[model samples]
Target chain A: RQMILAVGQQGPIARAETREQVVGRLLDMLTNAASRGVNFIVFPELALTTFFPRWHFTDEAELDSFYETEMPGPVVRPLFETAAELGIGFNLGYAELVVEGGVKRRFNTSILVDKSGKIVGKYRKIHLPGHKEYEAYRPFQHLEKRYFEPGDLGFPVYDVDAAKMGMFICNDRRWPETWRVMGLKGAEIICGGYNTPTHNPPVPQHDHLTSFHHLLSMQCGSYQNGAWSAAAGKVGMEEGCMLLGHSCIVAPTGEIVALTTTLEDEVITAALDLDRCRELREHIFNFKAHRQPQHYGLIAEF
Target chain B: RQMILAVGQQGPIARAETREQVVGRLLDMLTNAASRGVNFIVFPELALTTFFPRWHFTDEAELDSFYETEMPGPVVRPLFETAAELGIGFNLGYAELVVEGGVKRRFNTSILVDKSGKIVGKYRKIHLPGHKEYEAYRPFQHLEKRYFEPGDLGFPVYDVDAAKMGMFICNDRRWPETWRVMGLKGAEIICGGYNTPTHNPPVPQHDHLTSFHHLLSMQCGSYQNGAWSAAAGKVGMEEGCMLLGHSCIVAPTGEIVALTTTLEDEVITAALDLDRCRELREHIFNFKAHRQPQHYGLIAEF
Candidate 1:
C-alpha cells in the first residue's frame, strides 16, 4: 500500500516568538498536508524556538527557557490536538528537558506521534557535531556539545499503521550506522529532522556544497538500507545563522521523489509505496544474507 | 603536498582475448598516466579478464583458468614492469586462486603496489553482491557467491608515499561500513573499482539511475570519512552484458575533481591535496572526539 508523506520546511523561528505562534505555523502546514491526504508529516529540529545552539551561554536559567519539559505542553498542545483531529501522525524535533531519577537532564530529542496523538517513539541525537567549548575564532559558535549530552536512547524503530518507521535528529543522519541499526530492526521509513547551517564554520570551501551533501547523504542512506527517507529543515537565516533549506524525500532506489524549492515555509508531499522497501530487502540488499556482521566489529572499536 | 592520481577506465576483455592484449591496454593507460605526471593509478576489478562470474560452470578446471595464482604472473608481469619503469604505484583487482594448508581457496581480490613495484597491501571483497544459485528467470546470472569465498581480511590501510591509502572492490562501495573501517584506520585516499552493469535484474526502474547511485555512494562516502575516493569502471558492452561508464575521482569535500566522460579506454588524472583530509579529520569529523562507539554496537548485532 502507498501512504502519503509530507515534509514541513519552515522558516526560522525567532527567539522573541511565543510557543503559540510557532504552533500556529505548524498548524498551517498540517492543514495543507491534511488537505493533500498526507498520512504523516515531519517538522524540522528545534521547530518551536530559534537555533539557540548558535550562541554560547553560561547561565543555566537562560538556556532552560528554550527546552520543553513535556510534549504537548500548554503552549504547543494545539498542534497535537489538530493532528488528532485531522488523523495525521507527525515526527517533531525539539529541545527536551526532563527530570529522571530525581536528576535533571537535557537532550536534543524528537518524538514520533501516532494518528491518535500518542507518542509512539522517541530518539535522542547521537552524533552531535561542533565543539563543546566556545570557538571564538569562528563568526558564530555551535555549542551543541556543551549544551546537550550524547543520546542515551539508541536507534529505535516503531510501528505506525502499515509502515515500520524510525526517527533520528539532525547530525545523526551523517552517520550510516544510524540507518543500519534502524534497518536491522525492520524499519521501512526513516524520517530525520535537521538544522544544518549554510556556512561550514570549519571549512569555508565546503559552504557551497552543504545542500548537495545533505541530499546525497539521505539518498545513499535510503538506497543502501532499502528504505524511504524524509528530511525536513529549519531553514533560512535565523538570528544571524543561515540554515540550509532543501527538504527532501528519497525512495528506495535512491531518487529524490519530492523536494521543496523554497527556503521559506513550504510543505512537500509524496505518495510512498512501502512495498518497494520489502522488495529490496528481500532481494538486492537483503541484510540477513548479504551483510557480514562479524567483519564489522572494527566499526565500533575505537 | 598534493598527489597525482589516475583512474584507468577500459573496455571489457573477452575470455578469448589473449592476456597480452589486456596488458597492452593497461600499459597504454599507464603511459598516458605517466605523461600526465600521475603518481598513482587504479584499474577496474577483474581488469585482466572478462567478468566471468556471469556464466555458470560446473568444471573446476574451466574456472581455474580465469584465476591468477601469482601477483605478477607471466601475463601481468609486463604491466608491473612498466609501472616500475614509470615510477608510479597502481592498484589492480582480479580473481585470486591459492593453496593454503593443502586446501584450495578463491577470493575476489585487489592489491596495492608501491612505486618500487612491490606489493604493499591486499584487500578481498567482503560485501560480494548477487546470488549463488542460478535464477532461470533472469537474462543473465551473477554467481559471485558460488565462485568466491567471503573475504577474511579486515579493512587495511597502507602508507603510500605521503598518504594513507585503502582499497575495496565494486559492491563494497555501496556499504558505508566499508569506508568507515578504512577511515578509522586513517586512510586519506580510497580506491574502488567496479564492473556494474546498466541493467538491474530485480528492479528495472533502477537501470536509469545506476550511474547516479554509483557516484552518490562514492561522494557520500568520501565526504563522511574526510577522504578522497577514486572509482574506475569496466565500461561499454562486454560480450552480451552492458556496463555503466563514468570513472570519477572525488575530493574530501565531495566534489568530482576529475571524471571520464567516455566509455572507451581512457585515463583520468587529478591532483589531490592530502592536507584537506588532515584538516577535516582534525576539525569537522574528529572521530576520536566525536564518535560514540558505545552506542554503535547495534550495527553489528542482528
Candidate 2:
C-alpha cells in the first residue's frame, strides 16, 4: 500500500518571528497532518522565518541569525520530538550555516527525517540563482545569489521506507536539471520547498501562466521521470512581502492529488500508493531498463 | 503592414472522387480566401481525393491513380490558373509518386505558389505514421505506412515574398524535431496540414487533451523557437471517419491569434505580422544570440 504524504504549506512567517513561534506553528500543522493519517509531510523553504536577506550585504555580521548551525537545534527539537510523538516523518527546508573542516559554508538546505525521528538524508541546493548584486528600483526583489553560494552537493535521493525520495529548496525547482538528476537517481517522491512571489514583474506576459508553469514544470517532470512530486510553499504576505502559494502533491502520472485551498495556512494530504509507481516502472516507465544516463552525462559536461 | 494568412483546411477527398471535382473545391476555397484579402491559404494532405482508398489495399494497381505522378499535370492546372487569375498565393498538401533516379518513391508533399502562380518551394513529409496492415474490426482506420514511405528529402525552408516559411504534414507536428529543424533554418512561418481524429481508443485518458496537446505542441514550438505556426485542418466526420478540427494560428510568442470553430466547416483568418516574431527573438527566446545550435544538432543526430 502506498502511504500518504502531506505538504504543509504554512502561511508566511514574518522576518521577526522568534524560533518558538515558528516551531509552535509547525507542530500544529504536523499534528493535524498526522491526525489525518498522513505518514509524511513536507514544509516550505525557510519555514522558520521570512524570505529575507536578499539584498547584498557589506556587513556580514548583520545576517547571522538567519542561518542555523544545526538541525533540531534547541527550538527545532520540539518539531522532531513532536514528529516522534506523532509517529510521522517529514522533510523541512532551512538556511544552514556550517563550520566544517575549518571551512565556513552557508547553504540553502533541506533535510529528510524518518518516522522514528532519525535524519535519513540531507541535501544542499545546487542551483543558486538571482542577481548577486542589488538592482535598485526593480519591480520585485531577488537576492538569492547575494547571500547563498551555489550548492556543492548534487541532487541525491534516499530509500525512505518503501519510496526513494529526493529534496530541493526554492529557486532550484525552476531548473529541469534539478528534477532530471533526481529522476536519474530513481527518486519516487520529489519534495521541494518554495518561496515564490505571485507577481511576475520581470516578464509580465507570462504572468498568467506563472502558477500553471510552476505546476506544469512539476507535472511534466513527474510524468516524464515517472516520479511523484510534493511541492510546498511559504506563501502569502509575510510582513510586507507577498509570496505565491498553492502548494501541490502530484502523482507519478502527473495528476495533482492534493493541493492547498488558499494562501492561508493549510495542510493538504493525499494517500499515494508506492506500488503503483513500481508498476509504472515495471511497464512503460521502466527507467533502469530503458534510460541512457551516460549519454546525458557527457552532454552535460560538453 | 501585417498580412492575414487564411489557411483553408481541406476535408479528406474520398478515393471515389474524380480529379476535376477535387480541383473545383480547391479553387472555390482559394477564391473565398482571396476575396477576404487573405494572403495565403493551405489545404489538407491528400485533400485531392477520398482519404484515399480507405487504408485497406491488397493490390498496388488499385492505389496507383490516387497517387499523383506530377503536381499541376493535367488535373491541377486549373488550380494554378485560378490562383494566377485571382493573384493569390497558397500552399497545398497532396500525395505524390515520384520516379527519383529510376526509383519509384511515394511522398506526401506540399507545394507553395506565389501570387503570379510561380512555384516557390516543395516539401515532402518526413514522418509517416499509422499501421501498415488494415485492421478489419478496429474502432477507426489505418493505412499511412502502407500507402506512403517516409520522405528521403530533409526538412527545408522557403524564402517567400514576405515571410520565411516551412511546411510539415500531419504526424510531423507532434515531433519537436520537425519544428526545431525548421526554426534552425530561420523559418518565420511554419505551416502544417492535418486530419487528426479526436478518438484515442488506445489511451482514452489522453483523449480530452488531444486538442490541448495539439495546441500545446504548436504553442510551445512557436514560443520556444520564435516562429508563427498555422495549423489548418479538414475537420468533422468523413463517411464515418471523424477528423478533429480546430484549425489555429499561433503567434511567435505562443499566443493563439486565430482558431476555427470546432467540428465545423468554416474559414478562420488572422492578420499575422511577419515582424511580430522579431520582437520576441532577441529577448526572452533570443534564439540566434543565446541558442547553442551545436548542442541541439548533436541531440538531433543520436
Candidate 3:
C-alpha cells in the first residue's frame, strides 16, 4: 500500500512553559500535516517539555511537575481530539509517571494514537543513557538514568492503519539490537524520536559529529531491516545546551528521501510506498535465507 | 598503543589469470603498504580470484580449481613469506576446500597472519549471499550458497599486538548480528573485505547506491560498537561484472578517516590510536552499563 508520512520537528520548549502552550505547537503541526494529505505523523521525543533529564533536581516536587499522570490530561487532551477530528494518526512522546503494582514508576514513553483518538500502543524508552549519580564535574547534568527506570516492554511491533510499525526513542536508535528485534518481528515502518544535545558531557570530542551520528544510525537501521525509519528531532538550544534538528525520513534502500533543513519548527512529508521494502526483503536481506541466528548467541547473552 | 593500518584494494583479476600473477599484485600492494610503515593490512574477499561465484561449472575439476586445499598452498605460499619479510601482519580471503572427518567441505574463508607470518586465526564467512539453485535468468551467477556451507567458526576476537581484533567477510558486514557479537566480546578493531558487485541480481535498483550502502554499513558498525573498522574491497569490472573499490577505514566516531578514491590497486593508510575508541566506549557506547541482552533472545533464534 502507498501512503504519506510526516515528521514533526519541534523547536525548544522552555522549562517554564505551560503544557497548554506546548500542546498548541503539537496541535498546529498535526493539523498542518493532516492538511497536506498525511495519513500519519511523528512528533519529537519529550515534545511537551524541555529535556528535563538534563537537570538534576533534588526536590521531588520540581521533578514530579515534569511527568504526566495521564496521557490526555486536561492540558494535552486537545491534541488527541484534534487528531480524531482530522482522521489522522500520530506517535507522541512524553514524560510518563504512573503507578504500577502499587508503586510509582517513571519512564520516557511514547504512544501510538489512531485517527479515532484511541491509544493503540505504548512503548517505554529502552537504553536509557547518562550517569545515575550526579556528576558535579560535568557542565550540564544528564540525569536520564537517575530519573527514569529502564523500559520494561521489549521491542514490540504494532499494526497501525495497514502498517506494521515499531518504536524507539533517543538512545535506543544507536543500538542495533533494537532494530534487529523489531525487524525480526516484521516491522515495515519504524517511528522514533530524539532530543539530543550538541554537547556530550562525558565525551566532548564527539560533540562535533552529533548530527552525522544521528543520521547514520537511522539510515543503517532502515536499510538493514528493509524498512522505512522516520525520526523526529527536537532542535535548537533549550536553556544553555544546544540540540540539533535535521529530522529525516530514510527509505528502505538507505536513501534520505526527505529532510528538514533547519533547527526550528518544521514538518517534512513524502510519499511512502511500502512496496519499496519488498525488493530488499526478498533479496539481499531475505532474513530466513541469509540470517545466521545460531552464530550470534552472545548477542542475547548478558 | 597506536599503530598504522592499511586497506589494499585490488583491481580485477581475469578468469584465466594464474594464481602466481594475482599473488604478485598482492605482494606489490603489501610491500607498498609496508614501505609506508603499515603494521597490518587488509585485502579483499576472494582477492585471489575473479569472484568465480559469478560462474556456474558442471565439472568437478573446474570448480575444485578455485578452492585452496591448503593455506599458503604452494601457489599462494610466496605471499605469506613476503609478509614475514616485510614484518607486516595482514588478512587474506580465499576459497577453502578440505576433508573434515572424511567428508569434503567447502567454505569462503579468511586467515589472519601476524607480523611473523604466523597464521593466528581463521574465520569462515557466515552470511553468504545468493541462491543455491541455478537461475539461468540472471545475467551472472552469484552461487555462493551452492558452493559453500555456513561458517562453523563463530565470530571470534583474537589478540594481536595488544589489540583485540575481529574478522568479518563481505555479506557478513551487512548484518548487525555480526558486529554485535564481535563488540560484546570486546573486539577493539575489526578487519573485513568484500567483493560486492554494483549490480544486485534480484534488485538492480540498488546498483546506483552500492557504494553508499558499502560505506554506510561499515560506518554504522564502527560507531555503534565504539571500535575501529577497516574494510578492503575488490574493484573494477572483471568478466563483464563491475565491482566497487572505495575501500575505507572508519574510526569509532563513525568518520571515514581514509578511503581509496579509485577502482584500481590502491592503498589508504591511517594511524589508529586504540585510545580513540575510549571516548565512545566509556561514554555513549558503554555496553556493560547499557546493553539490554535479556530482551534480545530473538537475535539468536531460528
lDDT (tens digit, per residue) of candidate 2 on A19-112: 7898999999997887899999999987787777544566676676788988879989999998988889899999899888998788888989
Interface RMSD of each: 1.6, 7.5, 0.7
Q: What is the TM-score of chain B alone in each candidate?
A: 0.98, 0.92, 0.98
What DockQ number belongs to candidate 1?
0.69
Q: After superposing candidate 1, which stretches have Cα over 4 Å from the reference?
A: A100-102
Q: Could you tell me how far off, in angstroms, the CA of residue A9 lies in candidate 1 after the best superposition?
A: 1.3
TM-score of structure candidate 1: 0.98
> What C-alpha root-mean-square deviation, in Å, does candidate 1 show against the real structure?
1.4
TM-score of chain B of 3: 0.98
Sort by DockQ, best first.
3, 1, 2
Better of 2 and 3 by DockQ: 3
Local distance difference test, per candidate? 0.88, 0.74, 0.90
Residues B1-302 of candidate 2 have per-residue lDDT tens digits of 47878878666555566779878877778767877888777777666766763466767778877788877888889998877787777788888887869887888888888877889998887666555677776677666767787675566789777778888887677544566667767788899788777764434555565576567657766765678888878777876787778888888877788888756545667888888777556544554433323322223222
The segments of candidate 2 whose C-alpha lies over 4 angstroms from its true place after superposition are A1-5, A39-42, A45-49, A63-132, A145-193, A205-209, A215-230, A250-257, A271-302, B18-20, B40-54, B63-137, B143-191, B220-227, B252-254, B273-302
Give the number of the best model, judged by DockQ. Answer: 3
Most TM-score-accurate candidate:
3
lDDT of 3 by residue, A246-295 (tens): 89898998889999988888889988998888878878999988998888
| Candidate 3 residue lDDT tens string, B165-250 | 99999999999989888988888889988999998778887799989999999999999998899999999988899988789999
Worst 10 residues of 2 chain B by lDDT: B293-302
